[PDB]
Amino acid sequence: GTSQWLRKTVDSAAVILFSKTTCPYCKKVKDVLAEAKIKHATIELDQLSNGSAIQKCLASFSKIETVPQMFVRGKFIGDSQTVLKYYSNDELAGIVNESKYDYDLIVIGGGSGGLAAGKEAAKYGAKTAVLDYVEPTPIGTTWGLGGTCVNVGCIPKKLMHQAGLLSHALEDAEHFGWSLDRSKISHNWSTMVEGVQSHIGSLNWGYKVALRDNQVTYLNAKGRLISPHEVQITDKNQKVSTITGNKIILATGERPKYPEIPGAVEYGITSDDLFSLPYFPGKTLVIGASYVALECAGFLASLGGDVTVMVRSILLRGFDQQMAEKVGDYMENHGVKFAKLCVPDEIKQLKVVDTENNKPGLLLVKGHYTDGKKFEEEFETVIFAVGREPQLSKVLCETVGVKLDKNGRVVCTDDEQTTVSNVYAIGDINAGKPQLTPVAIQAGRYLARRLFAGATELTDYSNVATTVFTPLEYGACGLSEEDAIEKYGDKDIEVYHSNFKPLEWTVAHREDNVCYMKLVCRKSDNMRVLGLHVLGPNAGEITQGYAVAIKMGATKADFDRTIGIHPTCSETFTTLHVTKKSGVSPIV
Amino acid sequence: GTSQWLRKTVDSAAVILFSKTTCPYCKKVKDVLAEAKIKHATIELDQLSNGSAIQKCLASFSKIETVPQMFVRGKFIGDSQTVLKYYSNDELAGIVNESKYDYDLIVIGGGSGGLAAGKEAAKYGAKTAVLDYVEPTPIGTTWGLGGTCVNVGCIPKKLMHQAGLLSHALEDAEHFGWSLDRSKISHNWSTMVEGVQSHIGSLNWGYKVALRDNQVTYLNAKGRLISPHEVQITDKNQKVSTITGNKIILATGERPKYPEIPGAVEYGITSDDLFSLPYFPGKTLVIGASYVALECAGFLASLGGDVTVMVRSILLRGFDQQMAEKVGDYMENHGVKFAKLCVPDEIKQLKVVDTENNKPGLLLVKGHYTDGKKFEEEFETVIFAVGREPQLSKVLCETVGVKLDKNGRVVCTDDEQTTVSNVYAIGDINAGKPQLTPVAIQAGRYLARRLFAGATELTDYSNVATTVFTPLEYGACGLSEEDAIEKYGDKDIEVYHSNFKPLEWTVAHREDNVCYMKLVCRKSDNMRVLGLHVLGPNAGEITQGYAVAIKMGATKADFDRTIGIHPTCSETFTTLHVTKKSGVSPIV
Numbered sequence A, B: 001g002t003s004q005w006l007r008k009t010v011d012s013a014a015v016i017l018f019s020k021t022t023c024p025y026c027k028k029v030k031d032v033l034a035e036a037k038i039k040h041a042t043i044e045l046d047q048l049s050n051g052s053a054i055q056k057c058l059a060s061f062s063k064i065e066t067v068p069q070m071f072v073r074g075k076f077i078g079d080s081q082t083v084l085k086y087y088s089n090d091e092l093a094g095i096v097n098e099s100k101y102d103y104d105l106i107v108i109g110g111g112s113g114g115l116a117a118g119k120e121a122a123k124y125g126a127k128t129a130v131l132d133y134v135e136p137t138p139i140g141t142t143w144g145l146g147g148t149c150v151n152v153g154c155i156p157k158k159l160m161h162q163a164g165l166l167s168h169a170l171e172d173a174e175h176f177g178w179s180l181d182r183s184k185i186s187h188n189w190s191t192m193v194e195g196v197q198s199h200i201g202s203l204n205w206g207y208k209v210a211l212r213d214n215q216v217t218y219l220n221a222k223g224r225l226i227s228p229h230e231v232q233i234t235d236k237n238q239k240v241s242t243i244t245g246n247k248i249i250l251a252t253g254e255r256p257k258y259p260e261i262p263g264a265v266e267y268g269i270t271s272d273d274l275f276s277l278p279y280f281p282g283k284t285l286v287i288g289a290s291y292v293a294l295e296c297a298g299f300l301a302s303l304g305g306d307v308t309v310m311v312r313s314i315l316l317r318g319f320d321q322q323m324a325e326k327v328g329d330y331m332e333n334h335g336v337k338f339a340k341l342c343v344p345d346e347i348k349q350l351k352v353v354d355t356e357n358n359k360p361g362l363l364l365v366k367g368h369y370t371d372g373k374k375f376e377e378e379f380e381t382v383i384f385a386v387g388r389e390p391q392l393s394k395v396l397c398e399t400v401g402v403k404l405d406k407n408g409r410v411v412c413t414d415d416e417q418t419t420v421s422n423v424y425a426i427g428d429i430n431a432g433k434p435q436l437t438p439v440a441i442q443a444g445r446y447l448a449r450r451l452f453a454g455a456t457e458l459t460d461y462s463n464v465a466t467t468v469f470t471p472l473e474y475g476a477c478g479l480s481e482e483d484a485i486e487k488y489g490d491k492d493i494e495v496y497h498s499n500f501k502p503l504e505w506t507v508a509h510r511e512d513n514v515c516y517m518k519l520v521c522r523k524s525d526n527m528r529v530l531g532l533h534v535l536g537p538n539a540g541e542i543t544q545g546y547a548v549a550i551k552m553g554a555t556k557a558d559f560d561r562t563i564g565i566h567p568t569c570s571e572t573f574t575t576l577h578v579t580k581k582s583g584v585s586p587i588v
């Protein structure tokens, strides 16, 4: 075990020092590398279990069993006296900077995973480049550094969700004694977009400052992997060149799909365009039923829009369908219209967008319902949210040999390695993994540590918690009820559930029995919690802490013995007792 | 072992059936019992792993070894043939109601713990009485069934906190694009109090309905334990009488203290008076620094009041003091004034309360600082929040033999038993236990199950999480940092921490580095999490789920391997890395 690890670590690290904590000679070398501003990894052997087995194996590289020992890109450099010789003769800088490649690491893609990987690698002395380019949308929309979440995803969508939530805060304030009249207050779309975009701009700037402060080279250029170690780059003037790298991380993400129907690309938009749109959408049709579709429809309706959602089959395919139906029912009762069992056939243009006066155009949507009946209605804006896909044919020469699956995503090992040994993939393009920003960040940071600091920890992709930020939010961790029943059988599954009412909703005269939670449990395994589900306000804050308990294998008895915090929504999980099998009502 | 449990279970259960799940003669008895509306406990011997031994020890009571066996108040009643004989001869009803005492259980006190205990006991056939009486405050305030939390505690205080939080929602709404002008909106105290009190009234009514529906006798009378089984009751007409009970549960709670200074009782008020006050307090002095003091000062200032807090020594004594200082700093930066190191000497009346025009009076407060300098200022209302105390000399004759500690609270075993074998105590009067509503509820329900249904589960009072609902909320679970260091020594303690900014605060232009969290860990026990602390919005929702993980022994590694939910405040707990010993700044 120890030998294949130490070999892999020395071969991969850019600059690494084997040390001990009590070591005064080691202190001498650390102080020299610090003064020289040479970054490096450090492996303190006195804090590792097999530290003695390792110390003796280092001599197969250096012929000494003593500490400190410093290596650079696989080569032993010397002990304390020797390193000070190089430092004294001004030979050290040339030694630590000698490499077969331009960079130790090239990251293709500057989003959630790629920026995290690149910054973490540079901390251990890896010479790193991050490449980012944003292909414009069909109407020409583009944006800065940071990826999908930062510019056209989690960040602007939750800010517009908060704008919508504040509509009910205004309604509630009257009941709690404040003197405003909600009916006389309106919303200004362009004022919201300006504030959201100013925040996004601060994040674009922050990432560029962060890369420079970590000595990471940022290239605003499109990358193409043409051989295992060669990346062809095309810059903003279409100047083409080639850079070389030891390790490669692919982190290029996905973009929205369009349906293959007339007028879709020409006259519709996607979430890529929505978050910087310079006019209010007006009367809007959202086509699709993913979490993107429902999140966007929800805040547009709370901001005063006339909103319709067109649903081919079900809502939130892949999520617990009891919960998905509750999500949709709340939306329908609070101002969102649904066109059910329906698809589009054609989008026709009736008026062009008025870019001078900041007004939408007008469109005619023709479609049909699943029995055969026809759909025909006019909308000012049509938004497609029908899935996302990678486009690695742009990024990856087939001759390189990186295997993809039938969806176009990269087939990886459990340590993110592709079928080419020095090439790795992280984030949304890694086949079979949850497509979420904190997953991409953890994968990128953990991989960087394995490549350049001798770490062994892997990313754990199981039981990753989620939240859908619909008008009433939905948090989940673990299996849906139907997946648990399929895996283990109905007689081995027990479900505890309850409605609840937030205390904040009492004086505000909101609904008694719409919020809801359940625990899906396995009888034959000590009533283990397989899945947790909650529909209610602040659902992401509620859910997050329980994800640690589920990671540790919580049972129903662990929830029972823990005491609630009063008054909160979350405490209802600590006293659940009504089972679905019992048939007793869950109402409050 | 087994036989001590069986004798205790048979002796104290009111009506109990020993059974097996596959037992047609057991089903025959079950069907007769609740056709006759006879409530009872049931123990299914095949569900227990020593049921074979239990079934044999039953013969020491009944001289038979089969199931079913039915018992009433310690007496074997019969097997299947015998119970059916009593039924068809119309003898069963009188048998199940034979008792040495008027009640199987008398609960003294109708609050959080007492209502929970009484309702649970009745489920198993215990004939139960709940006594509740509310001694009026010095100015005459009184209220209905449900205890301190429902009427003058958690429920109205969090509703008034919400009214305060909505002030910032009105401010934020402009930045998110809404057309209102916060500076032209004012608050109406009396409108808010009316809505709060209408909800409280619905809870008073709901508890009376619940007790009637469970066949619990509710007496609105003051109780006094005059011997181990006799309770003297005084009703609202001063009619005095005596009732007897087998088991007694003391659940009488606490009331606010007043300082022994001139004018305090005559001219000041407490939290008992605040939540139904018919006029706005106006310019207010809060004397004290408990969570009650700071929560009340905080919402009064958010509702537009001129508020000062007079602090004898420190804020939130007994809570982590770094967190307490940050709580106070936020309040002082957001409109609360503090008179530090200061105590009151006298309250003098300048104007009587105007009960016609519905206006406060006016008071002169004289006090002094610890260095001897004088304090003198005028206020419309003075609120005392200087602790709470029981008054069991009003409930408990000294000759009964129930032992009290130096603070007047009841000394109990770990199963709530007092020094008198049939008398138990729960809730705030149980010495040494956290004084919280969910603790009192769990203790009451678990005790009723042990008395009348043969349960063995004890209440676990360790690592109970808390939240202080100040203008910026403070949630906690486990040890303070200073208690951890005192117990294990500084070299064995590692603290990870970070500032954070809620995404909702970005477009609203709120503060960058005020919200804060830390994990207090033990190095020599695998970095076990000894305490968790968070200052931020929705802190109670954030904290609750982590209480389950801490109950199961979470380590720092467990937090690290769990993935965050983005974008949330809570996710910052999943990526903490800055230690206090590194000296690295926690700002973000």
Ligand SMILES: Cc1cc2nc3c(=O)[nH]c(=O)nc-3n(C[C@H](O)[C@H](O)[C@H](O)COP(=O)(O)OP(=O)(O)OC[C@H]3O[C@@H](n4cnc5c(N)ncnc54)[C@H](O)[C@@H]3O)c2cc1C
Pocket: A108, A109, A110, A111, A112, A113, A114, A131, A132, A133, A134, A135, A146, A147, A148, A149, A150, A152, A153, A154, A155, A157, A221, A222, A223, A224, A251, A252, A253, A254, A271, A292, A394, A395, A426, A427, A428, A429, A435, A436, A437, A438, A440, B565, B566, B567
């Ligand atoms: C509307 C929406 C809302 C979302 N909300 C949430 C949410 O609330 N929570 C959550 O956890 N996740 C959310 N997500 C998902 C989250 O955005 C993604 O999981 C995450 O951004 C994926 O990170 P990544 O590093 O894999 O790719 P990305 O963040 O997409 O970054 C890849 C980058 O590489 C660039 N690139 C592509 N090809 C090349 C090339 N050849 N050369 C150079 N650069 C290239 C791309 O333009 C992009 O900038 C949301 C997604 C969407 C669309």
Ligand SMILES: Cc1cc2nc3c(=O)[nH]c(=O)nc-3n(C[C@H](O)[C@H](O)[C@H](O)COP(=O)(O)OP(=O)(O)OC[C@H]3O[C@@H](n4cnc5c(N)ncnc54)[C@H](O)[C@@H]3O)c2cc1C
Pocket: A565, A566, A567, B108, B109, B110, B111, B112, B113, B114, B131, B132, B133, B134, B135, B146, B147, B148, B149, B150, B152, B153, B154, B155, B157, B221, B222, B223, B224, B251, B252, B253, B254, B271, B292, B394, B395, B426, B427, B428, B429, B435, B436, B437, B438, B440
């Ligand atoms: C301002 C304030 C805010 C609080 N906020 C919170 C919070 O957010 N969260 C939380 O968990 N806890 C909170 N608490 C604490 C919570 O109120 C108590 O822990 C809880 O009410 C204790 O329940 P109990 O059954 O022990 O007593 P109580 O609820 O006080 O009930 C005792 C009852 O018995 C009655 N009684 C007394 N003597 C007799 C007698 N001789 N005969 C008959 N009846 C009698 C009393 O009048 C009262 O109705 C708060 C307390 C205060 C004061």
Ligand SMILES: O=C(NC(=S)N1CCOCC1)c1ccco1
Pocket: A312, A313, A341, A342, A343, A368, A369, A370, A371
């Ligand atoms: O047969 C197809 N399904 C159809 S039309 N519908 C299902 C959804 O509800 C409306 C009708 C099909 C083939 C290509 C696209 O659709």
Ligand SMILES: O=C(NC(=S)N1CCOCC1)c1ccco1
Pocket: A413, A417, A418, A419, A420, A421, A422
């Ligand atoms: O995906 C790959 N899996 C394999 S076989 N391994 C990693 C290297 O050796 C140990 C196992 C891979 C390796 C080289 C190119 O692709």
Ligand SMILES: O=C(NC(=S)N1CCOCC1)c1ccco1
Pocket: B411, B412, B413, B417, B418, B419, B420, B421
């Ligand atoms: O021992 C206590 N209670 C009583 S009366 N018993 C328990 C043990 O079994 C015999 C009866 C007690 C209560 C508070 C401190 O000690």
